[PDB]
Amino acid sequence: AKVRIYQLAKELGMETQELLELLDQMGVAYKSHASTLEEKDAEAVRELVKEQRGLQEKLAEEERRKSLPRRPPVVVIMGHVDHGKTTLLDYLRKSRIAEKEAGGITQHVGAFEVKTPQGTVVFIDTPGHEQRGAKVADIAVIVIAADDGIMPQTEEAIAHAKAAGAKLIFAINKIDLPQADPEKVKRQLMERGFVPEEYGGDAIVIPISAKTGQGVQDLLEMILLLAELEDYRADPNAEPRGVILESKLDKQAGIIANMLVQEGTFRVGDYVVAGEAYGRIRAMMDADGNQRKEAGPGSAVQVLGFQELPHAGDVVEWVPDLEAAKEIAEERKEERKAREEEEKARRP
Ligand SMILES: Nc1nc2c(ncn2[C@@H]2O[C@H](COP(=O)(O)OP(=O)(O)O)[C@@H](O)[C@H]2O)c(=O)[nH]1
Ligand SMILES: [Mg+2]
Numbered sequence: 608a609k610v611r612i613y614q615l616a617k618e619l620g621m622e623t624q625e626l627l628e629l630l631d632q633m634g635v636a637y638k639s640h641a642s643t644l645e646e647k648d649a650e651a652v653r654e655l656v657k658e659q660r661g662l663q664e665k666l667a668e669e670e671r672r673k674s675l676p677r678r679p680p681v682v683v684i685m686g687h688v689d690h691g692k693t694t695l696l697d698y699l700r701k702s703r704i705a706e707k708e709a710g711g712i713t714q715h716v717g718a719f720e721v722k723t724p725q726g727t728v729v730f731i732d733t734p735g736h737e738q739r740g741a742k743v744a745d746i747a748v749i750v751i752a753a754d755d756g757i758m759p760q761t762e763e764a765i766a767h768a769k770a771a772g773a774k775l776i777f778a779i780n781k782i783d784l785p786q787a788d789p790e791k792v793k794r795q796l797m798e799r800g801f802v803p804e805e806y807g808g809d810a811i812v813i814p815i816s817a818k819t820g821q822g823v824q825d826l827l828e829m830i831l832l833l834a835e836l837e838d839y840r841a842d843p844n845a846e847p848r849g850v851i852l853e854s855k856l857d858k859q860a861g862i863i864a865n866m867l868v869q870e871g872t873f874r875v876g877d878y879v880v881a882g883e884a885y886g887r888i889r890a891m892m893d894a895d896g897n898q899r900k901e902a903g904p905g906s907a908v909q910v911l912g913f914q915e916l917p918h919a920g921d922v923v924e925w926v927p928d929l930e931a932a933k934e935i936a937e938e939r940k941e942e943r944k945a946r947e948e949e950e951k952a953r954r955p
Pocket of ligand 1: 686
């Protein structure tokens with residue numbers, strides 16, 4: 608029936624003066640908040656309030672989806688042979704679960720994570736050295752032995768990592784050694800125009816012992832700090848996009864591929880295409896051996912269902928159906944072949 612303004616105001620959990628100015632902008636006349644509202648008007652208020660409150664919750668949804676979730680830094684390790692690359696990766700692999708008994712069951716997916724209080728770091732670990740494959744690492748850790756120092760190979764790796772677009776972090780290794788001269792290496796860096804932060808330059812340089820583990824925990828915090836600065840994010844709802852780390856044959860399983868997920872979320876049953884390779888994702892396994900229904904940005908998973916071995920560095924793309932996967936793969940397969948007469952029938 609006929610509601611009093613203060614009764615409706617309470618009904619909507621609304622402020623007296625708030626409802627009064629609402630009536631004012633609605634063009635509904637009154638005396639005071641004691642005044643009776645008609646049935647039309649009262650319903651118009653309930654309806655207008657519902658819309659205004661609807662839009663406000665809608666409008667705030669678009670705004671917080673504007674902010675994309677954080678993603679972990681993807682780190683690669685480089686530098687001259689014997690400088691400790693493998694030793695560092697091994698210590699890092701034994702770092703994360705360093706107090707646990709097994710389980711895992713631990714499997715090699717092409718990269719592994721280090722869970723740390725300040726955050727999570729992803730380390731590419733794969734055989735082989737340094738077209739090129741689509742961007743993988745955000746950060747390159749350039750390892751330098753303190754008893755040897757910068758070598759032409761070190762300079763090559765520094766150049767490679769910059770060309771690929773990686774941020775550089777210099778790790779001076781083997782500081783445990785008595786013949787180690789960390790300062791000498793620092794001078795070598797500065798001679799080449801890399802000036803350590805302590806001296807007011809932007810070069811990030813940390814002392815480490817891959818044998819001992821000294822500086823390693825500090826190296827991690829530095830990686831995460833540089834990530835905080837760089838502010839890496841990714842959209843888990845974007846069309847799924849990833850990169851092949853490696854492809855492999857297994858006697859029982861057949862063709863298997865490790866991929867790093869970059870954007871979106873891949874799901875079991877998805878059709879994917881990498882280069883000329885396509886397939887349906889049959890299964891996914893993470894570094895902990897667990898089966899995975901979904902893999903989001905930063906996730907490194909072993910994928911089943913590829914029809915051919917993909918190539919390392921090729922972009923894994925999501926496709927709607929099998930038909931699209933085949934057509935997309937075949938146009939690329941035909942591009943390569945047909946164009947190969949162009950490098951043959953022409954100049955050798
Ligand atoms: N003392 C000491 N030896 C190290 C350190 N890091 C690596 N090494 C040694 O360097 C040798 C080769 O290391 P490796 O990781 O295979 O070099 P890589 O080619 O860069 O991978 C091994 O015998 C390690 O024991 C370190 O921090 N301290
Ligand atoms: Mg080695």
